[PDB]
Coordinates of C-alpha atoms and ligand atoms in Angstrom, one line a residue:
Chain W
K1 CA -12.1 97.2 -30.3
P2 CA -9.6 94.2 -30.5
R3 CA -8.1 93.5 -26.6
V4 CA -4.1 94.6 -26.6
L5 CA -1.3 93.3 -23.8
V6 CA 1.8 95.8 -24.5
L7 CA 4.7 94.6 -22.8
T8 CA 7.5 96.9 -22.1
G9 CA 11.7 96.8 -21.3
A10 CA 14.2 98.6 -20.4
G11 CA 15.0 99.8 -24.1
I12 CA 11.6 101.7 -24.2
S13 CA 13.8 104.0 -21.2
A14 CA 16.8 103.6 -22.6
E15 CA 16.0 106.9 -24.8
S16 CA 15.3 108.6 -21.0
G17 CA 18.5 108.6 -19.7
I18 CA 18.1 105.1 -18.3
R19 CA 21.1 103.4 -19.2
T20 CA 20.1 98.6 -20.7
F21 CA 22.1 95.8 -19.4
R22 CA 24.8 96.1 -20.9
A23 CA 24.6 91.7 -22.9
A24 CA 28.5 92.5 -23.8
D25 CA 29.1 90.8 -19.8
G26 CA 26.7 90.3 -17.1
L27 CA 27.0 94.0 -15.0
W28 CA 24.9 95.6 -14.3
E29 CA 26.3 99.5 -13.2
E30 CA 29.5 98.0 -13.8
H31 CA 27.5 95.4 -10.7
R32 CA 27.2 91.6 -11.0
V33 CA 23.1 91.1 -11.2
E34 CA 24.3 88.1 -8.5
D35 CA 25.8 90.6 -6.4
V36 CA 22.5 92.6 -6.5
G37 CA 20.0 91.5 -8.1
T38 CA 19.5 88.4 -6.3
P39 CA 18.0 87.3 -3.2
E40 CA 21.0 86.2 -1.7
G41 CA 23.3 89.3 -2.8
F42 CA 21.0 91.6 -0.5
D43 CA 21.5 89.4 2.5
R44 CA 24.8 89.0 1.8
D45 CA 26.0 92.9 1.6
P46 CA 22.8 94.3 2.6
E47 CA 23.8 98.1 3.1
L48 CA 25.8 97.9 -0.6
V49 CA 22.7 96.4 -2.1
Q50 CA 20.7 99.1 -0.2
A51 CA 23.4 101.6 -1.6
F52 CA 23.2 100.4 -5.1
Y53 CA 19.0 101.5 -5.2
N54 CA 19.2 104.4 -3.0
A55 CA 20.7 106.0 -6.5
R56 CA 18.7 104.3 -9.0
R57 CA 16.2 105.6 -7.1
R58 CA 18.2 108.8 -7.2
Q59 CA 19.0 109.2 -10.8
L60 CA 15.4 108.3 -11.7
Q61 CA 14.4 111.5 -10.2
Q62 CA 16.3 113.6 -12.2
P63 CA 14.9 116.4 -14.0
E64 CA 17.5 115.5 -17.3
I65 CA 15.1 111.6 -17.6
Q66 CA 11.6 112.1 -18.7
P67 CA 8.9 110.1 -21.2
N68 CA 10.2 109.6 -24.5
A69 CA 7.7 109.5 -28.1
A70 CA 7.8 105.9 -27.0
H71 CA 6.3 106.4 -23.6
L72 CA 3.9 109.4 -24.4
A73 CA 2.2 107.0 -27.9
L74 CA 1.7 103.7 -25.2
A75 CA -0.5 106.5 -23.2
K76 CA -2.6 107.5 -26.2
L77 CA -3.5 103.9 -27.0
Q78 CA -4.5 103.6 -23.4
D79 CA -6.8 106.8 -23.9
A80 CA -8.0 105.2 -27.2
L81 CA -8.7 101.7 -26.1
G82 CA -9.6 102.3 -22.3
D83 CA -9.9 98.6 -20.8
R84 CA -9.1 96.4 -24.1
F85 CA -6.0 97.8 -23.2
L86 CA -3.7 96.7 -20.4
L87 CA 0.1 98.0 -20.0
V88 CA 2.8 95.0 -18.4
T89 CA 6.5 96.9 -17.5
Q90 CA 9.9 95.0 -16.3
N91 CA 11.2 98.8 -15.5
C92 CA 10.6 99.2 -11.8
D93 CA 10.7 103.1 -12.6
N94 CA 7.6 105.4 -13.4
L95 CA 8.3 106.6 -16.5
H96 CA 4.8 105.1 -17.9
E97 CA 3.2 106.5 -14.8
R98 CA 4.8 110.2 -15.2
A99 CA 3.3 109.7 -19.5
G100 CA -0.4 109.1 -18.7
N101 CA -1.0 105.8 -18.2
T102 CA -2.6 104.0 -15.4
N103 CA -2.6 100.9 -14.1
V104 CA 0.4 99.8 -15.3
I105 CA 1.6 96.1 -13.8
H106 CA 5.0 96.5 -12.8
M107 CA 6.1 92.5 -12.7
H108 CA 9.2 93.1 -11.6
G109 CA 8.2 95.6 -8.8
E110 CA 8.7 99.8 -8.4
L111 CA 12.0 102.0 -7.8
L112 CA 10.0 104.6 -5.7
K113 CA 8.3 101.3 -3.3
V114 CA 10.6 99.8 -0.4
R115 CA 8.8 96.5 0.7
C116 CA 8.5 95.2 5.2
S117 CA 9.7 92.6 4.3
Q118 CA 7.8 90.5 7.4
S119 CA 5.1 92.1 6.3
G120 CA 4.5 91.7 2.3
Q121 CA 3.1 95.6 2.1
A122 CA 4.8 97.4 0.1
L123 CA 5.1 100.9 0.4
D124 CA 5.6 104.5 -1.3
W125 CA 9.7 105.4 -0.8
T126 CA 11.4 108.8 -2.7
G127 CA 14.1 108.9 -0.6
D128 CA 17.1 106.8 0.6
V129 CA 16.9 103.4 2.8
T130 CA 18.9 104.0 6.0
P131 CA 18.8 101.6 8.8
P132 CA 14.8 96.1 7.2
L133 CA 13.5 97.2 5.0
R134 CA 14.1 96.0 1.3
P135 CA 13.3 97.5 -2.5
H136 CA 10.2 96.3 -4.0
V137 CA 11.9 95.3 -6.8
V138 CA 11.5 91.2 -8.0
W139 CA 15.1 89.5 -7.8
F140 CA 16.2 86.9 -9.3
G141 CA 14.7 83.3 -8.4
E142 CA 11.5 85.7 -6.2
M143 CA 8.6 84.7 -8.3
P144 CA 6.8 88.1 -10.3
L145 CA 4.1 90.9 -9.7
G146 CA 0.8 90.3 -10.7
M147 CA 1.4 87.4 -12.8
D148 CA -2.6 86.0 -12.6
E149 CA -3.8 89.2 -14.3
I150 CA -1.0 88.5 -17.1
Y151 CA -1.9 85.4 -17.6
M152 CA -5.6 86.1 -17.9
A153 CA -5.1 89.2 -19.8
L154 CA -2.8 86.9 -22.4
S155 CA -5.5 84.6 -23.2
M156 CA -8.0 87.4 -24.3
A157 CA -5.6 89.6 -26.0
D158 CA -6.2 89.9 -29.9
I159 CA -3.2 91.6 -30.5
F160 CA 0.4 91.7 -27.6
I161 CA 3.4 94.1 -28.0
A162 CA 6.4 93.4 -26.9
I163 CA 8.3 96.5 -26.9
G164 CA 12.5 97.1 -25.7
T165 CA 13.0 94.0 -24.0
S166 CA 15.7 90.8 -25.0
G167 CA 13.9 87.8 -24.4
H168 CA 16.8 86.6 -22.2
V169 CA 14.5 86.6 -18.4
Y170 CA 11.7 84.2 -18.0
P171 CA 8.2 84.1 -17.8
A172 CA 8.3 87.3 -19.4
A173 CA 10.1 85.7 -22.7
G174 CA 7.2 83.1 -22.7
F175 CA 4.5 85.5 -22.6
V176 CA 5.1 85.9 -27.1
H177 CA 4.6 82.2 -27.0
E178 CA 1.5 81.7 -24.9
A179 CA -0.3 85.0 -26.4
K180 CA 0.0 83.3 -30.2
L181 CA -1.5 80.0 -27.8
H182 CA -4.2 81.4 -27.9
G183 CA -4.6 83.0 -31.0
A184 CA -3.3 87.0 -30.7
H185 CA -1.4 88.5 -33.6
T186 CA 1.6 89.2 -31.7
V187 CA 4.7 92.2 -32.4
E188 CA 7.9 93.0 -31.3
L189 CA 9.2 96.4 -31.4
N190 CA 13.0 96.7 -30.1
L191 CA 16.4 98.6 -31.0
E192 CA 17.3 94.8 -32.3
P193 CA 16.4 91.5 -33.4
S194 CA 15.6 89.7 -29.3
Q195 CA 16.3 85.9 -27.8
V196 CA 12.6 85.1 -28.8
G197 CA 12.6 87.3 -32.0
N198 CA 11.2 84.2 -34.0
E199 CA 8.2 84.1 -32.1
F200 CA 6.4 87.0 -33.2
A201 CA 4.6 87.1 -36.3
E202 CA 5.3 91.2 -36.7
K203 CA 8.4 93.4 -36.4
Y204 CA 9.6 96.7 -36.5
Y205 CA 13.3 97.4 -35.2
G206 CA 14.8 100.8 -34.5
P207 CA 14.5 103.4 -31.3
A208 CA 11.7 102.5 -29.5
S209 CA 10.9 107.2 -29.6
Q210 CA 10.6 106.6 -33.2
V211 CA 9.5 103.2 -34.0
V212 CA 6.9 102.5 -31.5
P213 CA 4.9 106.5 -32.0
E214 CA 5.4 104.5 -35.6
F215 CA 3.5 101.5 -35.0
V216 CA 0.7 102.6 -32.5
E217 CA -0.2 105.7 -35.0
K218 CA -1.2 102.7 -37.3
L219 CA -2.8 100.9 -34.8
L220 CA -4.5 103.6 -34.7
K221 CA -6.2 104.6 -37.4
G222 CA -6.5 100.9 -38.6
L223 CA -9.1 100.9 -36.2
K224 CA -11.0 104.2 -37.6
Chain D
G1 CA 5.3 81.0 -15.3
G2 CA 7.9 80.4 -12.9
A3 CA 10.0 82.5 -11.0
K4 CA 12.0 85.4 -12.3
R5 CA 15.8 83.3 -14.5
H6 CA 18.0 84.4 -16.7
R7 CA 18.1 82.1 -19.9
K8 CA 21.5 81.2 -18.8
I9 CA 22.3 78.5 -15.5
Ligands
LIG301 C1 15.0 92.4 -12.8 C2 15.2 94.0 -11.4 C3 15.3 94.7 -11.6 C4 15.7 95.8 -10.8 O1 14.7 92.6 -14.0 C5 15.5 93.1 -14.4 C6 14.7 93.6 -15.9 O2 13.1 94.0 -15.9 C7 14.8 91.9 -16.3 C8 14.5 92.1 -18.2 O3 15.2 92.9 -18.9 P1 14.2 93.6 -20.2 O4 13.6 94.7 -19.3 O5 14.1 92.9 -21.2 O6 16.2 94.1 -21.0 P2 17.7 93.8 -21.1 O7 17.5 92.0 -20.9 O8 18.7 95.4 -20.4 O9 17.5 94.8 -22.9 C9 16.7 95.7 -23.2 C10 16.2 95.6 -24.9 O10 16.2 97.1 -24.9 C11 16.4 97.1 -26.9 N1 17.0 98.2 -26.6 C12 18.2 99.0 -26.0 N2 17.6 100.4 -26.4 C13 16.8 100.4 -26.6 C14 16.2 102.3 -27.8 N3 16.2 102.9 -27.4 N4 14.7 101.4 -27.9 C15 14.4 100.6 -28.1 N5 15.0 99.4 -27.7 C16 16.2 99.3 -26.9 C17 17.7 95.9 -26.3 O11 18.0 95.9 -27.9 C18 17.5 94.5 -25.7 O12 16.6 94.2 -26.5 O13 15.6 91.7 -15.7 C19 16.3 92.1 -15.0 O14 17.2 91.4 -14.5

């Protein structure tokens, strides 16, 4: 069986009720990235930033937020491939886990974890953060998580699939190039062509809830 | 690799 590496971004959770970065500004939930998504923003106004992520963490656990068909299809894909499958997500949500995927690499961290910053240790955390703990979230200027295992998988992949990601944020946006260098077949699945879509050998556009189960199903049937 | 970074500076 082929080694398959899947990269996901915010687009795969859009239809699950988790709103995406509006590309038109530089705003996330009506906030500037510099203020809520940098270490400097956190130093400058810790209680606003803590409040921002407290809000994101709560919204994540609302009943109307659920895995969609795309999350489920990736769980089925892992079921079929075993250890020849690796899922890397830029998302801080837990929808891959709720869908049934395991060993999900959260290269940008997790909303349901916080970090004792003198510690390097991440701790499970589902409630608000009050009065110094920080969100276990990778901010701009900080090193993404799990990169060693990710780059090893990129060099070994027979198929690399990028789902729901716009190709603006590095190093994740560079994964498609790295995969191609080591001979992988590359696939982009997205609502619209990404900033790096031209690097991909194969591509399909439309809502993830439709496009991803469609691609996964035709991948699985091609196996047997 | 490198740190998390956006396509515009
Ligand atoms: C840092 C800190 C987070 C707390 O990282 C975040 C984020 O992880 C990182 C990368 O962003 P990305 O995951 O690629 O998301 P966007 O740049 O916002 O692009 C979204 C992408 O999804 C497509 N899309 C929207 N809606 C859908 C549906 N229904 N189906 C499929 N695809 C969809 C859009 O067209 C975009 O291409 O940057 C942050 O700093």
